[PDB]
């Protein structure tokens, strides 16, 4: 009994690795000329119904918390936003001393020091002449220096460019596809807790419609889980790691800005146009959001029940409002129609659970300028949007951070906190992993190469 060795080319075997992915966007919107962020004009068109083919008798293990696509995706967004603001105009000439005063057009009692009516000198198209123009700025964009003498809050740290009106901030689905020689797996187990072997793993050349949203807590428009609201974590015993709760039935949230804002164009220089708020038409009403009272209470019921499986059954689980700190972590900030919101969420995470119609209204605040999460220094200016802004969205998951209490006092308090922007994408890239195909295996057989 003598047998020899052979080499088999094109043999199916894979190794965990990482590489650089590329575009995959729908071609339906290509005709709609939009040179916006997350571009479609410069990309490989996607493929209809990619070759998603099932696999059998295969066992593969996944790990979100050390995944590489989430890391690479982040740099993709960071490298894109910077490129999308280069053609836009800077705001260096606007850093001027302002003469401001309160605005009272029978303003509602809800807010008093929210809108400031500022007037400042500015250079017209001709360098010699100057003009006295006025605009309305939110209270979070002006600081006092010494009376009425205000300046933009971010004119002594770093100037930043205006958001180009041509581009848009709405999320466009982006599919991810591996290059030639690679393959993207995809777990399919319903009871997949993030880590461990996935029995029914299947391969696909391109990921499903992924729409990365920019939200801190209560991430919106996510991919719903199939069943059994699932609590995904890394080290649940440790309290320093976030908990990404994803639930099946989404609760609808309606957010509106009843103020009838009007846009006004001001010529900073030759071809340099700067937009600013004009005169508010009608009464001024605070921007708020609504979530159904009945569904939300039921939704927390599922989460609490699904959470006791890790902390026992006789545990007094009670939620608490946000921790307290930076304005973008206390509230939850979400883009809506080109304007950035900041909605107080203390009305939701306020209850206690024992182991034995109406609509919730919450206030919100708006900031024209925002300290970009992409980098510490450079900010961004959001031009006002005419009319009334209203947008509905799907709240699909939560980002709960546990409280590091003592071992005794079994009342375990959970608080919400966004913090890392990566987690918003990790909640949608929890199914895919990238692998490297390695053909040219070796096996034994019987031959004799004739001479």
């Amino acid at each position, epitope marked *: 009994e003598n047998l020899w060795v052979t080499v088999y080319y094109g043999v199916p075997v894979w190794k965990d690795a990482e590489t650089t992915l590329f575009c995959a966007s729908d071609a339906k919107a290509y005709e709609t000329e939009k040179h916006n962020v997350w571009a479609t004009h410069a990309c490989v068109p996607t493929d209809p119904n990619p070759q998603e083919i099932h696999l059998e008798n295969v066992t593969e293990e996944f790990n979100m918390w050390k995944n590489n696509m989430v890391e690479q995706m982040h740099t993709d967004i960071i490298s894109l936003w910077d490129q999308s603001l280069k053609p836009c105009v800077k705001l260096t000439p606007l850093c001027v001393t302002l003469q401001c005063t309160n605005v009272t057009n029978n303003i509602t009692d809800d807010m008093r020091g929210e809108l400031k009516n500022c007037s400042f000198n500015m250079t017209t198209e001709l360098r010699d002449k100057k003009q006295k123009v006025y605009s309305l700025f939110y209270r979070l964009d002006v600081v006092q220096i010494n009376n009425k003498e205000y300046r933009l809050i971010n004119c002594n740290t770093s100037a930043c460019t205006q958001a180009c009106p041509k581009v848009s901030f709405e999320p466009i689905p982006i599919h991810y596809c591996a290059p030639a020689g690679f393959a993207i797996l995809k777990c399919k187990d319903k009871k997949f807790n993030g880590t461990g072997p996935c029995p029914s793993v299947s391969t696909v050349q391109c990921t499903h419609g992924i729409k990365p949203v920019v939200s801190t807590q209560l991430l919106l428009n996510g991919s719903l889980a199939e069943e059994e609201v699932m609590i995904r974590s890394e080290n649940i015993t440790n*309290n320093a790691k976030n908990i990404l709760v994803q639930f099946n039935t989404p609760v609808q949230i309606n957010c509106t800005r009843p103020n009838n804002n009007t846009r006004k164009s001001i010529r900073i220089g030759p071809g340099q146009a700067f937009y600013a708020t004009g005169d508010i038409i009608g009464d001024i009403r605070q921007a708020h959001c609504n979530v159904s009272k009945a569904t939300w209470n039921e939704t927390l019921g599922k989460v609490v029940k699904q959470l006791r499986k890790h902390f026992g059954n006789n545990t007094i689980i009670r939620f608490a409002n946000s921790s307290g*700190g*930076d304005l973008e*972590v206390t509230t939850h900030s979400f883009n809506c129609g080109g304007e950035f919101f900041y909605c107080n969420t203390s009305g939701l995470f306020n209850s206690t659970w024992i182991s034995n119609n109406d609509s919730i209204t919450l206030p919100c605040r708006i900031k024209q300028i925002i300290n970009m*999460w992409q980098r510490i220094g450079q900010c961004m200016y959001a031009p006002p949007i005419q009319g009334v802004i209203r947008c509905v969205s799907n709240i699909t998951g939560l980002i709960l951070t546990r*409280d590091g209490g003592s071992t005794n006092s079994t009342t375990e308090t959970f608080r919400p906190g966004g*913090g890392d922007m*990566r987690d918003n994408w990790r909640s949608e890239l929890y199914k895919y992993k990238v692998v490297k195909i390695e053909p040219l295996g070796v096996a034994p057989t019987r031959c004799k190469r004739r001479v």
Partner: nanobody, 120 residues
Framework: EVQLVESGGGLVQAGGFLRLSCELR????????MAWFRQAPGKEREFVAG?????HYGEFVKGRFTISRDNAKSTVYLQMSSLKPEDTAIYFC?????????????????WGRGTQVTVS
């Protein structure tokens, strides 16, 4: 690898002056916000100061301190001043998960060794 180093600190006469520092070497400096926590004996950790894109201070700071981050050296300083005897504690340095600061200790994932400061 992500690691941090601290400054001297040391004993300082009551109502004196002191400066602390913390250098972030591993990760990028313009992608995270650093903050300082103090742990007095027989007490839990609490927030003192932290700089993301806008400075923040604790309840007991009362504007005495001053925090600023130098992008060139990738370090964060702390212009401690008017140290009352009650301020003695071990002052840690921590890096937040992202560019925002949370007063809860669970918002940071890379702590420092700890600088000992005493006031007499």
């Amino acid at each position: 690898e992500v690691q941090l180093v601290e400054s001297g600190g040391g004993l300082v006469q009551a109502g004196g002056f002191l400066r602390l520092s913390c250098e972030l070497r591993g990760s990028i400096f313009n992608q995270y916000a650093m903050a300082w926590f103090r742990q007095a004996p027989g007490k839990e950790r609490e927030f003192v100061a932290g700089m993301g894109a806008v400075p923040h201070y604790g309840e007991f700071v009362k504007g005495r301190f001053t925090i600023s981050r130098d992008n060139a050296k990738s370090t964060v300083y702390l212009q401690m001043s008017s140290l009352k005897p009650e301020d003695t504690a071990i002052y840690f340095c921590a890096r937040s998960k992202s560019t925002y600061i949370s007063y809860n200790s669970n918002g940071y994932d890379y702590w420092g060794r700890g600088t000992q400061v005493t006031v007499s």
